[PDB]
Design an enzyme around this catalytic site. Structure first.
Site, short mmCIF file in Angstrom:
data_model
loop_
_atom_site.label_atom_id
_atom_site.label_comp_id
_atom_site.label_asym_id
_atom_site.label_seq_id
_atom_site.Cartn_x
_atom_site.Cartn_y
_atom_site.Cartn_z
N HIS A 90 113.75 4.95 59.90
CA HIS A 90 113.51 5.88 58.75
C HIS A 90 111.96 5.62 58.09
O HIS A 90 111.77 6.61 57.43
CB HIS A 90 114.52 5.74 57.87
N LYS B 227 111.99 13.11 43.38
CA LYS B 227 112.22 12.32 44.35
C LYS B 227 112.21 10.86 43.76
O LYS B 227 111.65 10.62 42.79
CB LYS B 227 111.05 12.35 45.63
N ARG B 228 112.28 9.84 44.66
CA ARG B 228 112.45 8.43 44.13
C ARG B 228 110.90 8.19 43.69
O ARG B 228 109.83 8.86 44.22
CB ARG B 228 112.86 7.57 45.10
N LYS C 204 104.42 8.17 47.64
CA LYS C 204 105.14 9.62 47.28
C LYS C 204 104.13 10.14 46.32
O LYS C 204 103.99 11.41 46.07
CB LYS C 204 106.47 9.72 46.28
N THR D 220 113.48 15.23 53.00
CA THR D 220 114.47 16.10 53.25
C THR D 220 114.28 17.10 51.81
O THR D 220 114.94 18.45 51.95
CB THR D 220 115.85 15.64 53.29
N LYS E 284 115.09 21.35 51.21
CA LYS E 284 115.93 22.19 50.21
C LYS E 284 115.16 22.98 49.33
O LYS E 284 115.68 24.16 49.14
CB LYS E 284 116.61 20.96 49.18
#
Ligand SMILES: O=C1Nc2ccc(S(=O)(=O)O)cc2/C1=C1/Nc2ccccc2C1=O
Ligand SMILES: O=C1Nc2ccc(S(=O)(=O)O)cc2/C1=C1/Nc2ccccc2C1=O
Ligand SMILES: *Cc1c(COP(=O)(O)O)cnc(C)c1O
Ligand SMILES: *Cc1c(COP(=O)(O)O)cnc(C)c1O
Lengths: 809, 809
Positions: free
Chosen positions: B349, B540-541, B546, B648, B652
């Site tokens: 991952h 998102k986290r 990120k 992901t 969405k």
């Protein structure tokens, strides 16, 4: 099958079968291909439970409508046992269910044995609470049982090498279909913190908060459509409180309701116990006051609320009620106190000093600082009353103080209860008199009106109909079913004492119960008892005051007489002794070992044969009592006069056809008085004799010197006759008996064995032993908890019992 | 109401209403007079659950009959979210229930918001597991999800003073109606102990035993009557083990399943975590082998069993399977190894080094001594293969070793997984290539056949039909309902790109979703967003990779430009950033504070007005994602190229009508490739550019010196412009950006802001922005988890997916 179990209607059986299959499928998510006996029991339990809900909902709605006076029974113990069969019995669903499960190809009795006992109690005190709940629902009282939902009840006892081994009683492992979680009614309970005195009143601040989540369990009355509630609190940590460690430490607040302390008649002053005691009290009172405010001058509080303290365990209810009334509701002290005294009543269960709760001041100080201040204030104003009534009697003042001086200051919870209650009662006539004449004499002299008696009782539903249907049937055949909720009617059986048909039936039932148990003993535990022998049983918690040791001495005596004269005829006896010892009670654990050690010698002696057997009933609990008691011939109630406050096992035996051998202690006195001394095997010292022995001084040596048989027994014990590989294994026992026996076992030895000979003599005459049995059963009506509760209702709570069926389901 | 929600038959609605009332009465023990919204939700949940059981039972029976190959998906995380609505959707019961509850006078949507999220996951990895389960049931695979039943899932996030505060997620507090306890299937798991080498084989002895109790949760396929099972293990102490203290210490063994570690893409080497990892693996394999032995030469094991490792968390399954096969089943090593390799597959991952599991040897040594020996043996034989293939390449040997030397010896779990698996896959094309070219290059060269790609996907059921019924309806109006389980059909929408009616509908749905969310934002949390602005969201986290920080810089830039030229027209934007930070991730917590600090300045500046708003979405979780995503216009997927394996959330957003601004990272590359680069807002460095920057060396100072706007932003941060009372509050952030930014935020700053201007420009042309939206939705079919699962089934597990309805309920 049998009358008293209800009708098995065509519609009823059909409906039960489909709801059973409905639950097996939808509830258990199983099909007939992979279901195990446990799944079937649950399908059945849910099916039966469905019949209670309608009634449960409208019973609670009814109370809300009429708004009668409410009775709150606070106890840290509720020894419920199994509930499936009891629910069927009280709902008259037993035959319908037996039949419905039969058609589905299942043996209902096999399914009932799968149910886990709800062992949230230690013994007498806890069982009384259970019988009381049943009777209150049966007498239509708006009553609520309040306690703690322990996830671990009384430990399961295992015997290894003759020694007791304890293992956690994970009774919730597979789930409990009877309880209903009510997370919407969670209440906060406070601990620690400190007290701040502001302009208008004191405040309890900086406290640690623990949440109380309630679980309701239905309590069905006997065929009257009344279903009361037993509310048990569970400890939950607030979501408020390293991150991982913080989450794991929640299991510090929730430990409060983790396990039941396993002490029977013994006070262990641990903090966790005090927390449990405050936990149940704080949550309960909030629930009580909340329900009251709905029905705000609390002058009517005592007219709408009654709080019964089952012993001193929930005694903090007194200062807690004052705290709420004074600190929160802002009532003046005197008004609040009047209110408190009028709503609280206290029940005492024992006079043994080691059982009295005396909490160290430094503990209450840290855990409940505000309650300590209230207690000191209560004490202060109370001693002012004593001084005004007995001027100059300074010793009386220190004897009556709620605060006990000495090594470490302690608070006497019993004195607190007497001061803050309008009624104090003993549990048997002799016990209540002893309270007024000794232990609480000063309090009695100050307020004689507070002291009462309420002799204990057992419920005839679980203790007759449920465990002994065979006996219940032959009785009903003669006098009807009305006695089930009016035991006094059993007296009518007195006119059948000479009836040859009844004599034969009573004796036939006892024999069937014995065969049934003798089988159970081999099926489980693989034993070898002979159904034809006299079943001599003593089941109760292991205690020095209960004197299982006096029983052991008789057993060893019987053994030595057989070995002395092998070919002499002796009445065959199977002596059964069972019960659990508290984990830290060393002497009690030694007694269990002695018992099994005697069995190891006696049970393997070729000369003895099947004439004498010694069995130790493992893991004695409520469901095991339902099996042994109906099969018993002789009931052993041999505590030293003045130590057993009342006892209730004695009553269970009298109701099920066993004759009683015992001392004039507790309720034994009222039992012999009801049946007639000639129909009871009484022996030993009376209370007065024990006192005379104490004045003079008890010297066991004297008995050892004058009784050859007793001497031989003590020598066999000291020489290792019963412990070959460990010659001195029983040195503590011998030493205790000889030098520090508080219960004078030797003093009653001679009269006890002679009385046991009178028992064997009567047993050899089947017809007469049975007629005496009938005389006992016929006069046991007084010991029904329905009678006990009706007296509590009328003389303490101020409510009238009712036998009126509630308007259908 | 709307087509895709099913029919509301007359019989169906009537039946639902009566079963609802049946559960409210019999199950919840309540009546319409005292029921609360929570009771209604439970009545409804049980009613819906009843429709699953029939199917669940026969689906499992079916697998037992036909005995197909079984797929076991092992994951320590299953981010399920709510299950009521999803169950109705997959059973086509949504309109019937909406109607039935309507007639009963209840708003179903209000009842669904009462359901607690099953947050047993951190983010991407956990959600993928959830989407996968849904797709496997929909594709008729005999699959089982296996994991841990954490009583505390991901923590609930609270913002206090702009800071994140964590509080326990007690999601089981009120109960979980979907799970079914299966205490009859409890299995023992072993820990510690030691290894004994006897005549015939090694033995693991003197271990501590912990019990694993399973809880089954139904997983319904989409309208095909298939209901698979998700089995979650719970830790229970054996009844074997002061008495009170011993009972309380049981909460030491049960702590194993207490809480989920809250780390997203970060390895924390704590013992409790290793225990959880072994716990889930040991219990699962026993269940797997037991189920296999029923269907004893294990040569067929790989033909009946497939075990998918969701990351390295359940990697101990490899040495555990060997242990059982060798130590217990007594197969020879080589045979056992062949079997193991053929049944296990591993999914990687991330490539971030701080995420890689490297367990200290001294830990495995103490906790799992036998597994360590097996690991060394595996390593030994594996390096022999490497040496034979690359003679003399001694460096290759130490690089490929499962054992990592250094400060403290460690075991590289990723190397273990590659060695004991027949397939290793990345989660996006670019990620998979990166694995073969860098991180696992040595392994790829040794066994090129093991490496594959399986681009992630999301389930169109929960992520379209459930959260965006409005959009699902207008699509169905044109192409039917077939796309729900065949997303590729969405391409047919490409011919409506110029259809004026569709353009208007697509835009109308987005506007309604925005009004719906704008309301939710005020109803809960009392905010003030303007529905007419462009909804710019990044959820998102919180992570440095990120780059929520790159988003912040743009926000501050937009702000400074408005203040510079107040009366200039700028497209109104509401920028929403949400996500949780791991409790011990200091930098991530500082970023959350920066975000709220920017909002405190921007949201109260009179000159800004309603032109720019900065909101931080509190407690971002699965159910909140279902609300925000459908309302979004701009999707922020701005991770540094090469760091986001796949992502992901991006999928969405594309499915729900939002345009995407992002870097060529993870699945973003395949998304732009499907929609066309012209329909995507791509900016920043590509993977090659990042490498060139690293060769040369990244010097943030250079960008600070050459970009005036960036300089001003960094100076506002250092001078306390955003933290008046705490001037240096953000010194760590500035310091990191300037001296040690592993993700080169500044390097992408210029291209990012310019690209954001292109976004604002397109938004001013409603018609064209929408036509581009249509182009995105129409090409998002590839990202359905049904496609992903069909590839796993065919290229890894060796099973064929089926769309055949199971023979009714
Ligand atoms: O019932 C009990 N439970 C416990 C638990 C723990 C202890 S400890 O010896 O203080 O550790 C003692 C006891 C205990 C006791 N019960 C009794 C009854 C009569 C005389 C002495 C004791 C006694 O110590
Ligand atoms: O995600 C996380 N969870 C935790 C939990 C506890 C710690 S601790 O600082 O070692 O106590 C650190 C972390 C942690 C971290 N995540 C990251 C991501 C990038 C760089 C450094 C760290 C880091 O320390
Ligand atoms: C009734 C009962 C008791 C009380 O017995 P006594 O002989 O009065 O001490 C204790 N345990 C159980 C399980 C009982 O049913
Ligand atoms: C889909 C999802 C994620 C993953 O989002 P990314 O942007 O890929 O990191 C995380 N959390 C929740 C609640 C999600 O639904």
């Amino acid at each position: 099958q049998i009358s008293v179990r209800g009708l098995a209607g065509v519609e009823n059986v059909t409906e039960l079968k489909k709801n059973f299959n409905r639950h097996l499928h939808f509830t258990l998510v199983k099909d007939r291909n992979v279901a195990t006996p446990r799944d079937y029991y649950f399908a059945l339990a849910h099916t039966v439970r469905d019949h209670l809900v309608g009634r449960w909902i409208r019973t609670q709605q009814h109370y809300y409508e009429k708004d009668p006076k409410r009775i709150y029974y606070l106890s840290l113990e509720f020894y419920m046992g199994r509930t499936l069969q009891n629910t069927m019995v009280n709902l008259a669903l037993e035959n319908a269910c037996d039949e419905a499960t039969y058609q589905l190809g299942l043996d209902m009795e096999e399914l009932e044995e799968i149910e886990e006992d709800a062992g949230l109690g230690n013994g007498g005190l806890g069982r009384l609470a259970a019988c009381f709940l049943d009777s209150m629902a049966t007498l239509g009282l708006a009553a609520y049982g309040y306690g703690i939902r322990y996830e671990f009840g009384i430990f399961n006892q295992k015997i290894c090498g003759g020694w007791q081994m304890e293992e956690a009683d994970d009774w919730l492992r597979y789930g409990n279909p009877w309880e209903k979680a009510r997370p919407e009614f969670t209440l906060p309970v406070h601990f620690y913190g400190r007290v701040e005195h502001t302009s208008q009143g004191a405040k309890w601040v900086d406290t640690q908060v623990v949440l109380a989540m309630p679980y309701d369990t239905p309590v069905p009355g006997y065929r009257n459509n009344v279903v009361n509630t037993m509310r048990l609190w569970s400890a939950k940590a607030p979501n408020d409180f390293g991150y991982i460690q913080a989450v794991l430490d929640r299991n510090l607040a929730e430990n409060i309701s983790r396990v039941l302390y396993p002490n029977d008649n013994f006070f262990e002053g641990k903090e966790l116990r005090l927390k449990q005691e405050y936990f149940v009290v704080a949550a309960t009172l909030q629930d009580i006051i909340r329900r009251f405010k709905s029905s705000t001058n609390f002058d009517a509080f005592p007219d709408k609320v009654a709080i019964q303290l089952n012993d001193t365990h929930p005694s903090l209810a007194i200062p807690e009620l004052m705290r709420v009334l004074v600190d929160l509701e802002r009532l003046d002290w005197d008004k609040a106190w009047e209110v408190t005294v009028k709503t609280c009543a206290y029940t005492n269960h024992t006079v043994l000093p080691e059982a009295l709760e005396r909490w160290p001041v430094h503990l209450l100080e840290t855990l409940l600082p505000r309650h300590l201040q209230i207690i000191y204030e209560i004490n202060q104003r109370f001693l002012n009353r004593v001084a005004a009534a007995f001027p100059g009697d300074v010793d009386r003042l220190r004897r009556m103080s709620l605060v006990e001086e000495g090594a470490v200051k302690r608070i006497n919870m019993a004195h607190l209860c007497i001061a803050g209650s309008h009624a104090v009662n003993g549990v048997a006539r002799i016990h209540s008199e002893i309270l007024k004449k000794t232990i609480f004499k000063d309090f009695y002299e100050l307020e004689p009106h507070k002291f009462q008696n309420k002799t204990n009782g057992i419920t005839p539903r679980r203790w007759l109909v449920l465990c002994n249907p065979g006996l219940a049937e032959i009785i009903a055949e003669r006098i009807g079913e009305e006695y089930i909720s009016d035991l006094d009617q059993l007296r009518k059986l007195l006119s059948y004492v000479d009836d040859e048909a009844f004599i034969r039936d009573v004796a036939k039932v006892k024999q069937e119960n014995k065969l049934k148990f003798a089988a159970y003993l081999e099926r489980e535990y693989k034993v070898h008892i002979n159904p034809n022998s006299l079943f001599d049983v003593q089941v109760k918690r292991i205690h020095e005051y209960k004197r299982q040791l006096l029983n052991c001495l008789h057993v060893i005596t019987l053994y030595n007489r057989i070995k002395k004269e092998p070919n002499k005829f002796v009445v065959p006896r199977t002596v059964m002794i069972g019960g659990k010892a508290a984990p830290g009670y060393h002497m009690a654990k030694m007694i269990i070992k002695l018992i099994t050690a005697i069995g190891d010698v006696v049970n393997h002696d070729p000369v003895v044969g099947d004439r004498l057997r010694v069995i130790f009933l493992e893991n004695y609990r409520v469901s095991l009592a339902e099996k042994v008691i109906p099969a018993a011939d002789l009931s052993e109630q041999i505590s030293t006069a003045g130590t057993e406050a009342s006892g209730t096992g004695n009553m269970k035996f009298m109701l099920n056809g066993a004759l009683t051998i015992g001392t004039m202690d507790g309720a034994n006195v009222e039992m012999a008085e009801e049946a007639g001394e000639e129909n009871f095997f009484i022996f030993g010292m009376r209370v007065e004799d024990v006192d005379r022995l104490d004045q003079r001084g008890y010297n066991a040596q004297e008995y050892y010197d004058r009784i050859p048989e007793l001497r031989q027994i003590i020598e066999q014990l000291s020489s290792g006759f019963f412990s070959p590989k460990q010659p001195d294994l029983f040195k503590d026992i011998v030493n205790m008996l000889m030098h520090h026996d508080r219960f004078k076992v030797f003093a009653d030895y001679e009269e006890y064995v002679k009385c046991q000979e009178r028992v064997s003599a009567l047993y050899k005459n089947p017809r007469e032993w049975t007629r005496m049995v009938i005389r006992n059963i016929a006069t046991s009506g007084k010991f029904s908890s329905d009678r006990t509760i009706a007296q509590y209702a009328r003389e303490i709570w101020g409510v009238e019992p009712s036998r009126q069926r509630l308007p259908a389901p």
